[PDB]
């Protein structure tokens, strides 16, 4: 259970109301997204 937009756990993109994050808030690169990356 973790949000893949904003990157916190708890919940999931489709209850945040938040904006996305720049770029891999699950590995950290801003080139690309935690959607992009392969983790
Ligand atoms: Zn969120
Ligand atoms: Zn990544």
Redesign the pocket.
Known sequence: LTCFNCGKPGHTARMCRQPRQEG?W????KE?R?AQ?P?
């Not at 699950?26 to 690169?29: D, F, K, L, M, Q």
């Open positions: 891999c699950n590995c950290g690169s690309h935690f990356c983790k």
